[PDB]
Design a protein around this ligand. Structure first.
Ligand code: HEM
Ligand code: HEM
Ligand SMILES: Cc1cc(N)nc(C#CCN2CCN(C)CC2)c1
Ligand SMILES: Cc1cc(N)nc(C#CCN2CCN(C)CC2)c1
Ligand SMILES: C[C@H](O)[C@H](O)[C@H]1CNc2nc(N)[nH]c(=O)c2N1
Ligand SMILES: C[C@H](O)[C@H](O)[C@H]1CNc2nc(N)[nH]c(=O)c2N1
Ligand SMILES: [Zn+2]
Lengths: 419, 414
């Protein structure tokens, strides 16, 4: 009925009661902790495809209850009517439709509840685009182009989510097949090396197999591969003037520009599922702005990604014979300096890991003060470099699953039956 | 039943069955994870002790391929008699060695466990006085230090009886530097040790009031009041920190000690509790260079190093802290290696741990591991453990936390 978390740097202690409202399993038990498992749990709130009434209505009522509680009604005329309305809708279609206010509330609370996101101090400043009238992949492309243009905003980035029609029977899903709206292709080379982004090799081959003509470069913006109402997906080229990119250079190393590195400005996750009141929105691309380490540490320096540490260390004239010279650590810092300096030079929104983690601590305090807790996944929140010199490293966190939420979902090529 | 862990860099999958053998709590529930909680939330009765002892003896005889043997059954017989008649029992030397090694093997927060089976166990269960403890600890330090060629070792003092006669080393490690709070609010030496430094001074220690004073040993035998002892200085190996490129780094006056020797934990074997069990290995560089030197509440040297580096400290996004952190850690490693004092960098150490993990899953069915502690405090994702899924569970024998002695000791003098 109370769990404390301590900050070992400041000795601030916070007391969590929000976890009493947690809905589904974390994967852990009294005897085993799964805190570093990427997908520890298959506990879902509704089964399979179209639920029965007693499966869907309880989840709808819980969400509608929560929304009307949040606005200081509950039991109000409108709340009770809304319940009866959802009841008849489920009775007569096996599903129900969210009001615009409920949709906005649900999307913001899914972000507020995302325990792996260090950026949630921003959660209530989210632009919600209702795309539930969409019917074809051409319409999805139009909605996505507008999202990208609004969110990019000539570099002054703005958080947004575009929400396509919810799942019905499971055979008419709307899906963005891309993992992010904007990523670079990867190509398997004949000798066995990889050109471009190795993580995207499989998705790139699907695009090529669907007729995409690849330029076969290191930074080829992938097409959109969009699926509407369960049909076969269709390819679309994002107008390049909508794709803001930042050439990476270094404030001291004149030679850094000659590595030919660039990255895109808009991080826009498009493969997750948005769950609100038992409704599943299988296409719901959302975007914010980057923390530098996402590009500078993971995208650039993961061994299975662009893996650039060896090349940077060379130009730096570092001793690479032994691990203990820390040549990887030293190149890693310089790369992240360049990423930040380049984005900032071009006035493209970006946040460094010191500022972001500091904001998150402030967000945690805010959430404990007003909400009685903040679900947080230490394994994901602590940045992938310089961990203990950021404040979150020293902050204990409780992780639990609240709804509405963002969920993982299978890649659609593993499940789609082609027509 | 099986649980799978995946490495997201290599796609290697490992199957854990060993978790079925755990019976002590992690702190998590089915609906909350407390994996980042440092300390998630007293003498056993006869009835409590019997099953704990059986489980240990069973696993010991299993490990030596004599489960079910006559020797196995007579040992269980003998143990139960001792509990029945004395309310406790005594480990054979072989079981003590096995138990100590396996508490190490089971330490989910230790990245250095590839070495677990090479541990020198010093049986100090005949000790009766603080003078005896000092002698045992001096010999441990000398053996472990080995002129820089460090060797892992543990020294095990008598087990708890009624809880009123505990053996305790009051120090948190055998070798640490003092900390002194100044009148003006500043701190000289190690801020983490200010409280224990004050206790020492109160007990009669005359402090030099320098930045790197090796603390005296504060030793408690049989539940008596603890007594002060000065470790002979020639047994305390230290490394002056210099940098391979920055000639000014040596002018910072930094040094550290070579032997990491944890002395405030409790060793639990077969339900028996060894409250004084100091153990030592060798350092991973980041322990000194990231935490001891750069934690804001420790020596906190980032500012001074970055100044000497002429870094721009006006904005955080210059990553001046990150830049200075790396150079400090280069200096630590270079200094120890130059003086031929054993040390391991975080890249080598985490690679070894991955190989140790694989091996443990193959020969033992798993390896409990605390990702939050195993991942080094700098350069996290460029080490292989970052990408390694891990399962955390509590196996016994184990090393456990215990309260600080000055919070529970009832003083006997005057
Ligand atoms: C506005 C600035 C934002 C910043 C700086 C930020 C930062 C981050 C970072 C660094 C991660 C870890 C990414 C990784 O390692 O793969 C993350 C994850 C995540 N973010 Fe945010 N974020 C922002 C906005 C948003 C928005 C607008 C949403 C949703 C509406 C969101 C939802 C999520 C979710 C669900 C995850 C977890 C993804 C997963 O489990 O794979 N974030 N965020
Ligand atoms: C031989 C080389 C060894 C290396 C390189 C090593 C490495 C480490 C490191 C880096 C930590 C984390 C320290 C911290 O962040 O505070 C740790 C923790 C730990 N080590 Fe090892 N270690 C070694 C030997 C040993 C030995 C010999 C034992 C016991 C016999 C041991 C038992 C432990 C335990 C119980 C912890 C957890 C401490 C806690 O929770 O505060 N280690 N080790
Ligand atoms: C909105 C947003 C802002 C930001 N700064 N980063 C991200 C991200 C990411 C990285 N994805 C997360 C989703 N996962 C399925 C794959 C990896 C998202
Ligand atoms: C044997 C050993 C080798 C090594 N490289 N590091 C350590 C440590 C530590 C840090 N202590 C651990 C005990 N905890 C109570 C406080 C913090 C120990
Ligand atoms: C195994 C481990 O959980 C996995 O590598 C995680 C660790 N922490 C992470 N943290 C973030 N922000 N992003 C990630 O992709 C990961 N990967
Ligand atoms: C709050 C968090 O659990 C705490 O800061 C931990 C994080 N991981 C750690 N990891 C190691 N090796 N040592 C530590 O002291 C800590 N501290
Ligand atoms: Zn857990």
């Amino acid at each position: 009925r109370f769990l404390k978390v301590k900050n070992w740097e400041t000795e601030v202690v916070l007391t969590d009661t929000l976890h009493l409202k947690s809905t589904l399993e974390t994967g852990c038990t009294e005897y085993i902790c799964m805190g570093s498992i990427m997908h520890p749990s298959q506990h879902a709130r509704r089964p399979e495809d179209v639920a029965t009434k007693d499966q869907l209505f309880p989840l709808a009522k819980e969400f509608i209850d929560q929304y009307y509680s949040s606005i200081k009604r509950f039991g109000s005329k409108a709340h009770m009517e809304r319940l009866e309305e959802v009841n008849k809708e489920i009775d007569t279609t096996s599903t129900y439709q969210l009001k615009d206010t409920e949709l906005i509330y649900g999307a913001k609370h899914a972000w507020r509840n995302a325990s792996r996101c260090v950026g949630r101090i921003q959660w209530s400043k989210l632009q919600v685009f209702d795309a539930r009238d969409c019917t074809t992949a051409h319409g999805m492309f139009n909605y996505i182009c507008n999202h990208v243009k609004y969110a990019t905003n000539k570099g002054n980035l703005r958080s947004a989510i575009t929400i396509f029609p919810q799942r019905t029977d499971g055979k008419h899903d709307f899906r963005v097949w891309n993992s992010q709206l904007i990523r670079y292709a990867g190509y398997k080379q004949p000798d066995g090396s990889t050109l471009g982004d190795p993580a995207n090799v499989q998705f790139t081959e699907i695009c090529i197999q669907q007729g995409w003509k690849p330029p076969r470069g290191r930074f080829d913006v992938l097409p959109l591969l969009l699926q509407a109402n369960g049909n076969d997906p269709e390819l679309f080229q994002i107008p390049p003037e909508l794709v803001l990119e930042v050439p990476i250079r270094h404030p001291k190393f004149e030679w850094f520009k000659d590595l030919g590195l660039k990255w895109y400005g808009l991080p826009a996750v498009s493969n997750m599922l948005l769950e609100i009141g038992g409704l599943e929105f299988s296409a719901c691309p959302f975007s914010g702005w980057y923390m530098g380490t996402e590009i500078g540490v993971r995208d650039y320096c993961d061994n299975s990604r662009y893996n650039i540490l060896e090349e940077v260390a060379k130009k730096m004239n570092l001793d690479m014979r032994k691990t203990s010279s820390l040549w990887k650590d030293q190149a890693l810092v310089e790369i992240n300096i360049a990423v930040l300096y380049s984005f900032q030079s071009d006035k493209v929104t970006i946040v460094d890991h010191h500022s972001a983690t500091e904001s998150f601590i402030k967000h945690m305090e805010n959430e404990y003060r007003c909400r009685g807790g903040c679900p947080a996944d230490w394994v994901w929140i602590v940045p992938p470099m310089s961990g203990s010199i950021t404040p979150v490293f020293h902050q204990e966190m409780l992780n639990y699953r609240l709804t509405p939420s963002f969920e993982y979902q299978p890649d659609p090529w593993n499940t789609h039956v082609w027509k």
